[PDB]
Structure 1
Amino acid sequence: ELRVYPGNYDEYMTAATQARERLLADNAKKKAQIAELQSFVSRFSANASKSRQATSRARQIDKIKLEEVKASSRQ
């Protein structure tokens, strides 16, 4: 899709190549937060005292839905 960035071209160059970078950092925040909720789920799952709390974040992983990354046509 087309996005309108005011600025001439080199004030554009920052935003277009920064909004991509901030998306990859945000996308990698969830992918590192999911992998730390899987530390709890994979450890205290069969435990009787911590099962009700591990299945509280075993169903919290299913609500993050990291946004997809498309490839630039500028190859």
Structure 2
Amino acid sequence: ELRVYPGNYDEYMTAATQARERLLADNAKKKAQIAELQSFVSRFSANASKSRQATSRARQIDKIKLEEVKASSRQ
């Protein structure tokens, strides 16, 4: 799509690079906050005293829905 950044060119560069590394960072913040939730769900799952708690976040794992990363047209 056509996304307009107010800037001459060196503001556009530091905007469209920072706002892409921010996309990667805010996606890694989900990809790594799913990991330890899955560690809990994989460890205390069959345990009778903590199964109701493992199943509480095994369902918040699948309600996170990380945002996809597209491919740049420049190669």
* TM bracket (short chain): over 0.9
Cα deviation, residue 13, structure 1: 0.5
Unaligned 5+ runs, structure 2: none
Cα deviation, residue 11, structure 1: 0.9
**RMSD of equivalent CA atoms:** 0.5
Cα deviation, residue 17, structure 1: 0.7
* TM-score relative to the length of structure 2: 0.98
* TM-score relative to the length of structure 1: 0.98
Give the Cα separation in 2 of the matches to 1:43 and 1:12.
Answer: 47
Alignment match, 2:31: 31
After the TM superposition, list the runs of 4 or more consecutive aligned residues in structure 1 that deviate by more than 4 angstroms. Answer: none
**Greater helix percent: which structure?**
1
Cα deviation, residue 21, structure 1: 0.3
Could you say which structure has the greater relative contact order, defined with CA pairs below 8 angstroms and 6 or more residues apart? 2
Q: How far does the alpha carbon of each residue in 1:20-51 deviate from its partner, in whole angstroms, 9 at most, with x for none?
A: 00000000000000001011100000000000
Counting matched residue pairs gives 75
